[PDB]
Amino acid sequence: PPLSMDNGTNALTVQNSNAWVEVSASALQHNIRTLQAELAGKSRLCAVLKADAYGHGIGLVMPSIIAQGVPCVAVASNEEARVVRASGFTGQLVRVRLASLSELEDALQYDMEELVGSAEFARQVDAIAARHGKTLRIHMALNSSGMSRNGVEMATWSGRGEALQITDQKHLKLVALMTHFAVEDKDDVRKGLAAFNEQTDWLIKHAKLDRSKLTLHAANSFATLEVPEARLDMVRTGGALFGDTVPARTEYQRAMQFKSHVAAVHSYPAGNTVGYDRTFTLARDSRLANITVGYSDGYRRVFTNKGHVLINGHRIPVVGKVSMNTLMVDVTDFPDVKGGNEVVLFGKQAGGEITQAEMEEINGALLADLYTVWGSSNPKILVD
Amino acid sequence: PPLSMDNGTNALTVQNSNAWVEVSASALQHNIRTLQAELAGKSRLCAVLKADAYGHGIGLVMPSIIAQGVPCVAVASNEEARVVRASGFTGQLVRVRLASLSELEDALQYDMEELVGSAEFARQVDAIAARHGKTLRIHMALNSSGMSRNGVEMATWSGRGEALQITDQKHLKLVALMTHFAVEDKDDVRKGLAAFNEQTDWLIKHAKLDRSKLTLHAANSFATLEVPEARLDMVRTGGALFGDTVPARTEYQRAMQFKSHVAAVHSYPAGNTVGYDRTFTLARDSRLANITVGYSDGYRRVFTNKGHVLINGHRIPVVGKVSMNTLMVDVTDFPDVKGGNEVVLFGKQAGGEITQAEMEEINGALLADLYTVWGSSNPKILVD
Ligand SMILES: Cc1ncc(COP(=O)(O)O)c(CN[C@@H](CCCCN)C(=O)O)c1O
Ligand SMILES: Cc1ncc(COP(=O)(O)O)c(CN[C@@H](CCCCN)C(=O)O)c1O
């Protein structure tokens, strides 16, 4: 959780960092490159890079997005925008959530295209562009797939009207329409798509604006890889980039490993308890590892008496409550674990693996919900 | 999360922050002044400032610590220490968890007193001081309340022996004995104190130790407040400083509020469902507020269709799965809610209140499990 950053770059080493997150530079390029070919010049790529690149370091990943000349980049937070631009990405850059107004105003300087899903929203945002002399480009979000989140519900006549006035805006230039698929099911994406289609068609036709000057973009990762017809003009892909997408497509390589150190290993007696509130009772006569990681560090409380790490290839049980900065793990079966070893909180360790599958199960929600904040709470460090 | 930062300083402002953590400098400055009094100058005070000050900004909490002549600070990570010193705090600086050697070593530059819990750990560490020409000051950790965590187990001769060789180390000034308590409970905390006493007595004796050179220091916050006799030479408080301690002690004030904005408000019709996986169906023609905060932001997935947030003092419910960046709430009952409105996700807003108790409920862990990380994934902004 570095306390000094210069556009995503810290001064930290693996040596002097307590727990760290390893972005694989290589897996990255292999993922970009693979998508780029699978897509096949039938579609463009926005690399979906919000959440600081899903906890991978927008600043760390920007090199490689530039490297594989990816044309487009989605962000969410204003900083993500500053950093992309400050990397020299002279390309298309779009926000993939609604902003707040003040926020959006600041953003103006970064020349980002802004998402709009409502006429009242549109209206204000317009007066903000007028105010600065600038012309602001906008993606119109359409609730085609049923998210009820960013975009206008073009299902009812009200929406269709709201949609019109979004385009009546004299200081906003319209340049896309979009929806985002809501269920990761083939059939359900397929309806979403059929809807997005009529609604685009409808709005294009009836607001006498023209195809040629818009990009229509609905496909997320799962959508791109599974319902390719849903590709259309451009796709925005987070997960797949980083190798958590459809578990079956194993050509998409994990980009992020989460790791800590072993502080030291202590002995304890039969009948001791471990961590707050005496949750675990020591069954035999034990050796424990003080691992320099906690919930402060990201490794959440919910892993209490449930989770496992890897050390020296060894699958090793988390024991007792997870303290704020220190994790306790039973090495009582593994005499070969020693001070300064390397803990793998998530990933593979020559032999072993902590599965995304098994961590999600413990957590109660998807893995992003953990790793996008592991990102925030530790140093991201480039590798391969 | 600011992507550029200096010692925990950022050019981020409530205007362009998408969500953010407000640290109340009076809530702080009060809380310290309160302890310092309640203590009566009869017992020394460490500001336990770990996890970047329990997610409050450590480089933020510092200038007040310095100005109130708090003599000691307790940090966890190396950066935390760098920043304490960067800030001009000059006095006693201990680490409250075993470090791993590489990390311990890097830290030598900051003059920190290091926690030590076993003979082997000690000798190793002796080695490093040795190599460096330094005399490292060490706090011995006892397992008196039986956390089984950093503390040498003194309930067993072998362990007892370990203690003794920890003290036989040539290159380490042993300068405290401490332990930490496992149950926030008047009785269990007492047993542990009584234990800790005989063990400190014993060590001082058998190791032939100048009592006037040791700090005997055991009490956390709860212990300090609820069990005076455990104050001994010094205490170690975080929660209290931040107003997250014994709910009953209301003289200690919350120093943190969690906050975000309304993106805009969309009319979605009955029958629509909200967010990934159709988790929620609209029983009525709704007005849904789009909030520029999400699980990547720290506001985690556990709150799907569970949470409440305040706008204009209104208890408004989370609807649909908390997405990565945006959060959807139901303002159909609350037409005062417009775009741009400030949102409390945790705290108080004119007359309403999002209680620690009600969030812990849904989380399943103490509030620190959430908010130490809110700290990390959001900019912290000083107030009052
Ligand atoms: C509007 C939008 N466009 C593109 C993407 C990229 O999708 P992908 O990562 O699934 O390829 C997202 C992901 N944001 C999701 C994360 C979905 C979790 C799956 N990785 C959210 O808001 O929760 C998105 O919200
Ligand atoms: C060794 C030690 N000493 C003192 C404290 C300060 O406790 P206080 O916050 O009650 O003043 C801690 C905090 N670490 C704990 C406390 C949780 C914070 C909730 N109060 C942990 O690792 O969960 C600690 O690990």
Side-chain angles (χ1 to χ4, degrees):
Chain A
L3 264 44
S4 254
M5 267 191 231
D6 180 10
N7 275 199
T9 57
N10 46 70
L12 276 69
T13 63
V14 173
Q15 272 61 40
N16 63 189
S17 291
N18 75 96
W20 70 104
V21 134
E22 292 186 21
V23 245
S24 165
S26 155
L28 226 93
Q29 337 277 59
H30 169 89
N31 293 316
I32 299 158
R33 214 195 312 277
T34 300
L35 276 209
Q36 277 193 320
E38 161 77 23
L39 263 190
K42 310 256 165 55
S43 255
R44 249 159 51 235
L45 191 39
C46 291
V48 185
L49 253 31
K50 34 149 193 204
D52 200 1
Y54 288 38
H56 292 101
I58 218 174
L60 263 70
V61 210
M62 218 53 225
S64 314
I65 304 278
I66 303 185
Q68 342 277 345
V70 170
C72 168
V73 175
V75 299
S77 78
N78 268 2
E79 279 268 296
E80 280 148 17
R82 174 170 64 73
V83 183
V84 155
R85 230 40 132 171
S87 84
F89 179 78
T90 212
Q92 147 163 78
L93 167 59
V94 58
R95 207 176 208 122
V96 291
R97 64 153 155 88
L98 295 204
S100 33
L101 299 172
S102 34
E103 171 161 28
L104 173 149
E105 195 171 20
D106 202 71
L108 259 45
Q109 102 213 267
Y110 299 117
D111 249 80
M112 177 172 44
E113 345 209 302
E114 295 273 13
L115 184 76
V116 174
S118 192
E120 192 44 29
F121 183 62
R123 202 130 37 213
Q124 274 134 217
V125 161
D126 182 320
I128 284 140
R131 206 147 62 174
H132 290 81
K134 219 135 182 183
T135 264
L136 181 60
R137 275 149 295 153
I138 52 168
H139 296 36
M140 183 169 144
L142 319 181
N143 195 33
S144 319
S145 178
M147 275 308 273
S148 299
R149 200 184 45 170
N150 283 333
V152 8
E153 172 80 71
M154 285 271 299
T156 74
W157 285 101
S158 263
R160 308 226 146 164
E162 265 203 85
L164 289 171
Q165 29 210 17
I166 277 160
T167 99
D168 202 50
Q169 265 32 228
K170 7 80 171 302
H171 291 99
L172 309 199
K173 158 156 269 229
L174 190 57
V175 319
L177 320 147
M178 55 103 341
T179 194
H180 183 226
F181 298 113
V183 186
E184 275 181 355
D185 187 79
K186 293 270 268 290
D187 293 350
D188 181 298
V189 165
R190 237 152 218 158
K191 304 186 203 176
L193 187 64
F196 185 68
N197 290 303
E198 55 202 28
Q199 332 213 295
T200 41
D201 280 24
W202 187 87
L203 184 282
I204 275 107
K205 184 170 167 75
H206 285 104
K208 281 172 196 70
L209 30 82
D210 57 62
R211 265 318 255 109
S212 263
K213 301 200 49 214
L214 312 184
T215 25
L216 275 51
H217 63 281
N220 65 2
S221 275
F222 171 80
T224 302
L225 306 159
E226 298 291 325
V227 192
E229 58 263 22
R231 286 156 183 202
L232 333 172
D233 290 333
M234 167 170 79
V235 325
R236 333 159 231 116
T237 29
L241 259 59
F242 318 106
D244 120 358
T245 161
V246 178
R249 301 307 215 89
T250 57
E251 75 272 27
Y252 289 99
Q253 274 166 33
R254 217 141 68 252
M256 195 219 64
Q257 305 264 292
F258 183 27
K259 274 177 197 165
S260 172
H261 302 89
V262 148
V265 183
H266 292 169
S267 273
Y268 297 94
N272 273 57
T273 61
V274 197
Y276 298 98
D277 289 347
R278 322 184 172 291
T279 34
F280 208 75
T281 292
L282 282 190
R284 69 256 227 170
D285 219 31
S286 315
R287 305 270 294 148
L288 270 43
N290 181 354
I291 287 153
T292 66
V293 90
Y295 56 85
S296 127
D297 276 312
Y299 201 80
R300 208 163 282 166
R301 247 275 208 276
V302 42
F303 295 108
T304 288
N305 304 126
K306 295 203 192 47
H308 306 68
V309 298
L310 303 182
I311 320 174
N312 295 310
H314 298 129
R315 162 163 286 259
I316 292 159
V318 145
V319 273
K321 303 279 220 64
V322 188
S323 282
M324 191 194 272
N325 310 101
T326 286
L327 188 62
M328 246 40 205
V329 310
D330 181 287
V331 290
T332 290
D333 264 310
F334 291 101
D336 84 320
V337 176
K338 317 230 179 185
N341 280 178
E342 214 193 61
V343 188
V344 163
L345 307 183
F346 155 81
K348 283 186 181 55
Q349 191 186 51
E353 185 180 318
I354 274 106
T355 77
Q356 178 187 345
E358 82 182 51
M359 280 198 85
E360 280 165 348
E361 180 261 323
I362 298 194
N363 178 48
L366 84 181
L367 210 82
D369 182 80
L370 277 108
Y371 70 72
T372 60
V373 92
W374 290 349
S376 286
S377 292
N378 307 286
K380 332 227 200 332
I381 286 168
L382 244 228
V383 295
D384 338 294
Chain B
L3 297 197
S4 273
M5 203 202 218
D6 181 47
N7 291 208
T9 288
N10 48 74
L12 264 77
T13 78
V14 153
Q15 275 70 39
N16 54 210
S17 295
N18 78 103
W20 78 90
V21 166
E22 285 190 15
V23 202
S24 161
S26 36
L28 243 27
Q29 193 254 305
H30 176 102
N31 286 331
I32 300 192
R33 100 183 168 246
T34 292
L35 272 174
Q36 278 181 338
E38 157 68 10
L39 267 194
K42 281 188 304 201
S43 197
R44 225 157 103 239
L45 163 102
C46 308
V48 176
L49 257 34
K50 64 185 164 147
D52 201 17
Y54 278 45
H56 292 77
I58 201 206
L60 246 34
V61 167
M62 273 324 299
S64 309
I65 311 237
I66 279 156
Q68 304 290 355
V70 190
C72 155
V73 157
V75 323
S77 94
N78 268 344
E79 276 291 282
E80 260 139 29
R82 164 169 89 66
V83 186
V84 170
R85 297 289 189 211
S87 76
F89 168 86
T90 232
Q92 172 188 62
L93 170 51
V94 348
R95 174 192 247 125
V96 275
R97 60 139 172 95
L98 299 183
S100 53
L101 310 176
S102 18
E103 150 169 61
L104 186 152
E105 172 149 23
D106 165 76
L108 263 24
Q109 44 166 323
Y110 308 128
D111 245 280
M112 182 164 45
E113 297 163 344
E114 282 287 348
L115 193 70
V116 170
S118 61
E120 165 79 342
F121 187 70
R123 108 180 66 269
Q124 303 228 81
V125 155
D126 184 321
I128 322 291
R131 198 156 81 260
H132 265 95
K134 266 200 76 191
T135 304
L136 182 45
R137 292 167 262 125
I138 57 152
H139 285 35
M140 185 157 148
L142 307 185
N143 217 70
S144 301
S145 183
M147 279 278 293
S148 306
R149 186 181 115 193
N150 294 266
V152 32
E153 182 53 293
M154 296 266 285
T156 55
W157 299 106
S158 42
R160 289 262 180 161
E162 285 206 82
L164 268 129
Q165 23 175 329
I166 284 164
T167 92
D168 254 319
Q169 291 321 295
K170 326 277 49 196
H171 309 105
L172 327 179
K173 254 269 245 65
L174 167 79
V175 338
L177 332 166
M178 51 79 47
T179 178
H180 197 223
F181 295 108
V183 193
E184 306 212 315
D185 178 280
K186 229 81 61 70
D187 274 12
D188 195 285
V189 163
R190 260 163 189 132
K191 295 203 193 218
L193 166 64
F196 178 72
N197 293 306
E198 76 85 11
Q199 315 188 28
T200 67
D201 273 2
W202 184 91
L203 211 291
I204 302 272
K205 184 181 181 128
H206 283 94
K208 316 276 257 309
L209 262 160
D210 188 330
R211 238 314 264 172
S212 100
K213 254 44 102 331
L214 305 204
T215 314
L216 258 31
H217 76 269
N220 52 38
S221 225
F222 170 98
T224 294
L225 286 188
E226 281 311 315
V227 183
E229 70 266 37
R231 298 171 194 204
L232 295 159
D233 288 14
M234 157 168 102
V235 279
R236 255 187 288 106
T237 63
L241 259 22
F242 304 120
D244 169 2
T245 173
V246 193
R249 291 298 182 93
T250 68
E251 77 266 44
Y252 291 92
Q253 304 182 0
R254 250 170 316 160
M256 168 176 180
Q257 299 281 278
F258 190 34
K259 239 142 202 199
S260 183
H261 301 119
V262 175
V265 193
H266 301 152
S267 289
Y268 297 119
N272 277 48
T273 52
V274 173
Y276 304 126
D277 292 311
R278 328 280 184 188
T279 28
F280 186 90
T281 327
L282 293 184
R284 82 275 205 62
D285 281 6
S286 308
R287 287 281 299 175
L288 258 28
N290 181 335
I291 286 91
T292 84
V293 89
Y295 66 68
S296 84
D297 281 300
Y299 202 78
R300 82 169 44 126
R301 266 272 245 251
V302 135
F303 292 101
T304 305
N305 308 120
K306 285 268 219 346
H308 295 82
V309 327
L310 309 175
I311 350 253
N312 303 343
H314 290 122
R315 174 148 310 241
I316 297 163
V318 166
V319 272
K321 271 183 165 155
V322 171
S323 341
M324 188 183 278
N325 289 75
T326 12
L327 176 101
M328 281 321 230
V329 312
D330 187 8
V331 298
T332 323
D333 301 323
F334 299 104
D336 34 71
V337 161
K338 276 125 153 24
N341 295 179
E342 224 198 32
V343 198
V344 152
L345 299 139
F346 163 72
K348 283 204 240 215
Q349 197 181 14
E353 140 113 80
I354 292 313
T355 57
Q356 168 179 334
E358 117 221 48
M359 296 207 108
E360 296 183 305
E361 167 60 78
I362 308 170
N363 190 39
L366 90 179
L367 201 83
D369 175 81
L370 274 151
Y371 74 59
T372 54
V373 210
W374 293 346
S376 308
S377 335
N378 293 306
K380 293 167 227 73
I381 285 171
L382 235 216
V383 297
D384 322 318

